[model samples]
Target: TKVITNQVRLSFVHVLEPHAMEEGQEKKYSCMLIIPKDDKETLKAMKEAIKTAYEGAKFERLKTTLRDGDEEMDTEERPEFENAMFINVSSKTKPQVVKREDGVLVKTDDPDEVYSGVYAIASINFYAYSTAGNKGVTAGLNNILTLCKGDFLGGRANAESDFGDL
Candidate 1:
């Protein structure tokens, strides 16, 4: 119902997988959309987009909390979610991956070649769904436009570079 255009960090991008959140639906692509708190403009747009996505659809107000890493930490002094909000987004179509450096899709034999740190805009839509006991608003991934590639999510990318001669 709503499509918010904004810069986001991708996590758990499942373009490589062919499964639905529940089942029976066609293949889908999914990822977490992370927006730093400092990006007020994006936050505003997202809220507006969701509002539109919900009101007409008559879906319940989104109760999902923006994830801010808590169990993991740098230090007590480290301010968390001090910059952005992280929300999950996805689509029924396999997202198109691109390298921000050139705005081209990353061509690699491995699907995992597209890691979790790429900067891109998620084309998403909010829909209302209900099960036997639970129902809520969720995102559907349409296509991912890679703006630029960044460092890997957990550690260094080229581990071979670490060992010089050993």
Candidate 2:
């Protein structure tokens, strides 16, 4: 008898909720990167890809706004937004370009890899854009990764984990 293993699936879910404000008022955005489980290799690959994407593109930090359940709250005393080159990894198998506009993209080949890549880029951007007196955006990226897992080793999970939580 042969045992069949299923490949893990990962995707980045980004929700861009528009805030109503006066003209020239800064904009606020919220995003999330979801992965299947505890696939570290995929995460590493994604980070590398993000580095390449960032180096290839040019961006400038504008402002950072507090996200309150789809509502853009007051500014953090300081105005700062992450400078990012939104790379699209919708097709994992083939290299995808990061679009300037907003939308979710999933890589075709290794979904895990693509998801991780997106997460890494987002995390880095967060840190880069954060204002003075605030913790680096890297902390936010770590939180996002942990959120995807839900629990230690309890995240999405790979075939080796027997398709179940430890």
Candidate 3:
């Protein structure tokens, strides 16, 4: 049910951190895609792709709940998911991490700069699903482009990053 990159700049990014809370879970990087309502073109493209994916599926016409992000529920205290509507995408493959420092892109090792609220463009696709209860079109991540660095939503800095004051 997936297609091409809709090209909506995610202003609110909760997707970059790599984590798996429980055991036996495969670790993957996920991001919350915040597509602004103003992005009609992107939304249009996404809808088109979703339709195509639904048709391509083996199942009957897929039912979808895809729509703009609702500020009422989504807008929590967090401003990132503000007036923007979005869909999230994740990847098992680590995205090519790069930053615009001087004039070109350079890969970075430090996770400090790769913070949330940063701008990113995702190469995404849609797929049809037939879970026990849920069955519909879902978005998938193929690759990502970290456009710019943003405020540090630094997650639990691993306690192992350092012991108490030595």
Model 3 over residues 1-166: C-alpha lDDT tens digits?
A: 4444443455334345555535887777766666777777777888888888777864445676454556445356455556667676766666666666778777764545455666656677787777797889888676556766556543544455766565
Task: Please list the Cα RMSD from the true structure of every candidate, rounded to 1 decimal place.
Answer: 7.9, 17.7, 6.8
Error of model 1, residue 116, in angstroms: 1.2
TM-scores of the candidates are 0.64, 0.24, 0.68
Clashes of 3: 9
Question: Residue by residue across 1-166, what tens digits does model 1's lDDT show?
Answer: 6565577777656755655767787656677777776777766766666666566653354654345544332324333223546766666556655444455456342444466776677666666656784655665666666664655555334446767556
Give a tens-digit lDDT track for model 2, residues 28-122.
33333332324445444444443444444333432222122212212242111121112211111212313222355442323333332243323
Please list the residue runs of candidate 1 whose C-alpha ends up more than 4 Å from where it truly belongs after superposition.
19-27, 58-62, 65-82, 99-113, 155-166
- Model 2 clash count equals 17
- The model with the greatest TM-score is 3
lDDT of 2: 0.29
Give the C-alpha miss distance for residue 122 in model 3, angstroms: 1.3
